[model samples]
Target chain A: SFDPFASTRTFNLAMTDIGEMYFMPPLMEALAQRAPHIQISTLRPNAGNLKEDMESGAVDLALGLLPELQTGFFQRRLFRHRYVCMFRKDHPSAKSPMSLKQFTELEHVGVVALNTGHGEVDGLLERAGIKRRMRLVVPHFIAIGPILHSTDLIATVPQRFAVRCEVPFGLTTSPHPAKLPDIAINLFWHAKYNRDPGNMWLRQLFVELFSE
Target chain B: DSFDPFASTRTFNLAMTDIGEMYFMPPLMEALAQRAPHIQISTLRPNAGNLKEDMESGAVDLALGLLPELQTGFFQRRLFRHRYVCMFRKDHPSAKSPMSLKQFTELEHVGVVALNTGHGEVDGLLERAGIKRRMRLVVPHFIAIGPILHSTDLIATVPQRFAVRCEVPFGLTTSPHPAKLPDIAINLFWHAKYNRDPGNMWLRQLFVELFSE
Candidate 1:
C-alpha cells in the first residue's frame, strides 16, 4: 500500500470561512511543526460557489457544519457545538431564562450560517409554529455582537461563540425558550486524491485539537 | 488604507487566544517590517470568533493563538506544543502541597474569561469536569489574570508563561492540568496569494522564528 501520509508533499488547501482565524493559527502552527513541507493555502467559500471550487479540485477541503451539507466530496464530522441566545445588556429582554413566547415576539438579528439552512434556534421556533421577527440577516456568526448591541435585535449562535464574545461586546447569553440543536462542524474533503499527504495532516491535526 | 474589515457597523471582530497576543505580535511585527518592508503590515487584536468576511476577503493577514476548528480549505501550521500550568497565590488557606484532578475540579474557581475571547482555559476545563462551584467574578483578560494572582484563594489555570510572569514577584504558584488535556499548539496563516510571494514569505519565516518558542 502506498503511504498516504508524506511530509515532502506540498498541497494547496481550501478552507471554509472561519472568520477570525480561530483555528487557523494553531493549525498552521501544527503543520509547520509536524509537516513543514506541505504548503497550504486558504480560500473561503461563498454563497456564489465555494463548493464548486472543492468539487472541481480547486479546493481540497472545507471546514463547516456537516449536518446541513450533502455535497459530492467526503465529509468528516469535526465536533458538536451547543446553542445560546445573545442580547445586549440594555435590550428589552436581557435577563436569563428568556421564554419561547418572548423569543417569538422579539426582533432578532439572525446569524446566517454557510451550511445550516436556518439558525438552529429559528428551526426550533418553526417546529413550534412560532415565527421569529427577523430584522436583519448577517452572513456569519461574528456579526451577532454588533447587531445585538447597536440595536434591539437578538442573535442565537453556538455556545462556544457566545462565550467568546459576551463580555467585551456587552452582551449576555440566555437560555432559548425551547431546546435548540447542537452545531456539528465538519471538514469536507474531495475524494479525488485519496493519497494526498497534506490533506491527511490537516485532517489529523484538526482531530487532535478537538477530539484528541 | 482602502478597505477596513471592521468598518462595518454590523460586526465587531476580535481575535482571542490562550497566549498574550500583544506580547507575541509586537516583537514579531518589528522584525517582520524590517525583513519585508514592502508588504505593509497592520495588526488587529483578534478576540474569539473573528468576522468571517474579513478572512474570506483576505482582510485579516495573520492570526496567532490557540487553534480553533477551521474550514478544511484553509491552511494551518503548529508552532509550539503547550502543557497545562495551574496557578494559585502562595499563601492561600486552602492551597494544597500537590493538587490532584479531583481537588482542582471540586474547588471554588475564579474563571478568568477574556473580555472578548472565550472562557480561556480555566472556564473550559472546569465546566467539562461537571464540578459545581461559585464563579465569584468574570473580567477581561488583563484584569482577570491580575485578580486571579492577587486574590489568594482564587486558583485559575493560566498559560504556563503567564503563571511564570505572575508567580515570581506576585507570590503565585504553578502546577499541572487537573486532567491531561491535549497539548496546545500556536500557529500562523495567511491567504494563498501571500503564501508564495517573497514579501509575505520573508515576513512569515521571521514570525515562525520569533514565535516558535
Candidate 2:
C-alpha cells in the first residue's frame, strides 16, 4: 500500500484558483485532523493563468481545468454545477419559477466567460427552442449584485456560486427553465508532481474529506 | 471659499492619500479638498457605506464614491456614466476576439465582485448574458486587475473608465465587449447638513471641473 502521509515530509502543497482561497480554512481544518505535519498555502494566479502558475512550479495543486488536461496532468472530478436564474426580489419574475419560454423571451443580463461559447447553457436553451437575450456579459460574479439591485435584468449563474452569494446580494434564486448542462469542475496535478509527498498528503486529505 | 475654509477649521483634521473609498466620486472630493482647505481633506480609500458613515458622523468632511444613497437626506447625483470592457493579458488565450457578449460570458471562470452585494458592473453583465455559470473565481476590483494580467487563461470585465486610466501603465488593453450594458454612472453626494456651507461649495465646484475634464 501507499504511505498517505509520506508527501507531508517532503513539501507543503500549493493550490491555486480563485475559489481555492476561500475554501482553504475548511481544507486546513480537515488536514489538521488527519495529517498535522502537512501544511498548505495558496497562491492567487495573476490575471487568471492558473495553469501557468502550476506549470511554473509555483503551485502544486489547483482546482480548475487547464487548456490541455489529459496531456500534461492527471485530473479528477471534484464536483459538478449548473447555471440557474438569479434575480432580485423586486424583479418582475422573482416571485415564481419562470417557464423556458418566459426565460428566453425575457430581457436578461448575460454573464460571459471568454474561454468559449456557452458550453452547457447554450445547448440546453437551443434544445428548448429558445435563445437568451443577453443584455450584458461580465467576466466575474461581483457585478451581478449591483445589476440586480438597480435593474430589472435577471442573471443565470452556477447553483454552487448562487448558494454562496444569495445573502450578500439580497437576491433570490430560481431554476433556469431551460436545461443547462451541468459543469464538472475537476482537481488537477502535474504528472511530475506525482512523487511529491506533500502532494500525496494533501490529495489524500482532500479525497478523505470530500469522500466522507 | 476663504470664509468656508475657516468655518471648517474650528474643529477638524485633514489628510490626503492615493488609495480607497470606492463609494465617493474622486473628482468631486478632490475638487472640494483642493478648492477649500478650510474643510480639511483626508484621503484614504474606504467603501461606499463607510464613506457615508464618515460623512454622516463628520469623521470625513466629504467623499466621492460609487455607492447608492442609503437615505434621501443625503444628496446624490449620477455624475459620469461608464460601461464595461474586457481586459486581458496581451497573450490571453480567449482574447482572440474582443469577446462578444456571448463569447464573453462563456469564459470557464472569472474573478469578480461579491455575488451578494452585486457591486461590480462585470458581475451584472455576466448574469445578463445568461452565463452566470461561467464565473468560477471572484475578487474585489483591487485584486482583479493583478489577476487579469498574469493569467492568460483568465479574463475580467472592469469599469471601462478605470481600465482606460490604468491600461497603459498596467500592460492591459480595454475593448468594448458586445453586450447590452447599462451605463455605470459615478455618483456624487453630500450630507444634507453640508448643503448650504461655503466649503461644500468649493468642493462641489472642484468636482464639476474635474468631471468636465
Candidate 3:
C-alpha cells in the first residue's frame, strides 16, 4: 500500500536559478524513468522564511547548496560543485584556457538572485581584489544561453551547468581563476516529512540519481 | 510632471511565463532602462490559479503572453502573432532549407513542455495533421531547447521569435513547420478598473509601442 511510484501527487521543490539549471535535467530524466506519474512544481524559497514555507506545506523540499536552513531542518549532502567562467566559444578577447587577468578584463552577465551561496562567488572575487564589470544583469539562469551565445559577455557559473550549456549555447568553460571554496550541494526537507513516504520517496530518488 | 508615471519612483508589476520571458526581456529590458529609468519591474506567474486575485488586488498592473482566462474583467491588446519555427544544429545530417513534411515528422525531436505557457498546442497541431515526432528528450522550459538542439541531432519546434532571437547565437538552422498550423496571438492584459489610470495607460501603451506588430 506504500507505493511511492504510483502515487499521483504533485510536489513543490524550492531551488535557486543556477541550481535548477545544474540539477533539473538529470533529475527530470530520473523521474521520467521511475516516477512517471508524479508532478513537480518548482519555486525559489525565501531565505528569510524557509521554515514558514516548509511548515505550511507550500514547499516540499529545497534543493541545492543552500546556506539558509537554520535549525529544525534535516539535510543530506549530495555533492560538491565548483564555479567556472563561461563565454561564447568564439569570444574574440578570450584566451583558450584564460588567465586571471583575462577573466577580470571581460565584461560579465550578472545573475542577480541565485541565493546567498551564489553571492559567495562574487564576494570571494571581490575579496581577492578582483573587480568585475557586469555588462548586463538578469534574474535567473534561463536567459544565460542567449546572452553568452550572442555577445562577448561572460558568465561565472557552475561547472556542471557550463558544460551542459556549452554546446547548445555555443559556449566554453575554464576554471574560475581565483581560489574559491567548493559549494556543497544538498537536499533539505522538514523533519515533519522526514519519514513521509511520498517525500522520502522523492528525496531518495534525487539522491540515488545525483549523489557523487 | 506630477502625473507622469514614468517619472515616478515605483515598481511596475506584470505577469508572464518563462518561455515568454526568454523572448520578452532581452529587448524589453534594454528599452525599459532608458524609458522608465526609475521604475523597477516585477513579474508574477499568472494563470487561473492566482490570476483573478492578483489582478483584482492590483498587484499585477499588466499581463502578457497567451492568456485566455482574462476573459471577463480585463481589457487586452494584441501584441503580435507567433508561429512555430523548427530548429536544429546548423550542421545536422538532415539539414535543408524549407524542410519537407516527411523529414520533419521522421526526425528525432527534443520536446518542450513549458507548462502553463500552452506550448504543447503546437505539438497537437502537428499530430492533428498526422505528423508525429519521435521525441528523444523532453525538457521543462523553452530556455533549455536552444542548448539541447546545439549538442544533439534532436530538432525542436519552438515559437518564431525565440528561433529568430537565438538562431545565430545557438548556431541553428530554422525553418517553418512543414505542417499546417496557426499562429497564436500574444496579448497584453490589464484589469478594466485601471483602464483610465495614468500608470496603467503608460504601461499598456509602452508595451504596445515596444512589441505590437
lDDT of 1 by residue, B44-68 (tens): 4453245344555656655666546
Cα lDDT tens digits for candidate 3, A1-212: 34756856777777765666556656656665576666565665653466788867778898876665767689999888788888888888987677898888877776655455676677778888999776455555777766677667688887767766777667888888878788777899988888888888888888988889
Identify the CAPRI category of the predicted complex in candidate 2: incorrect
lDDT of 3 by residue, B70-183 (tens): 899899899999888789889988856698988987787767666566676766777787776765555556655665566667678888887877777678889887878778
lDDT of 1 at B49: 43
Candidate 3 ranges beyond 4 A from true positions: A1-79, A82-139, A144-182, A186-212, B1-7
Going through the candidates in order, their DockQ values are: 0.01, 0.02, 0.14
Clashing pairs in 3: A168-B147
In model 3, what lDDT does residue B111 have? Answer: 73
Best by DockQ: 3
Which candidate, 1 or 3, has the higher lDDT? 3
lDDT of every predicted structure (CA atoms): 0.54, 0.52, 0.73
lDDT measured at residue A26 in model 2 versus the true structure, 0 to 100: 53
Clash totals in order: 30, 55, 1
* Model 2: per-residue Cα lDDT over B17-124, one tens digit each: 111222222332333334443333334333323666677776655544454544666876545776766776666656655576666656544455533232455555
| DockQ of prediction 1 | 0.01
DockQ of 2: 0.02
Model 1, span A75-175: residue lDDT tens: 76767666677888887655677887777777665654644523455566678787875544444543344446555667777665665456545788887
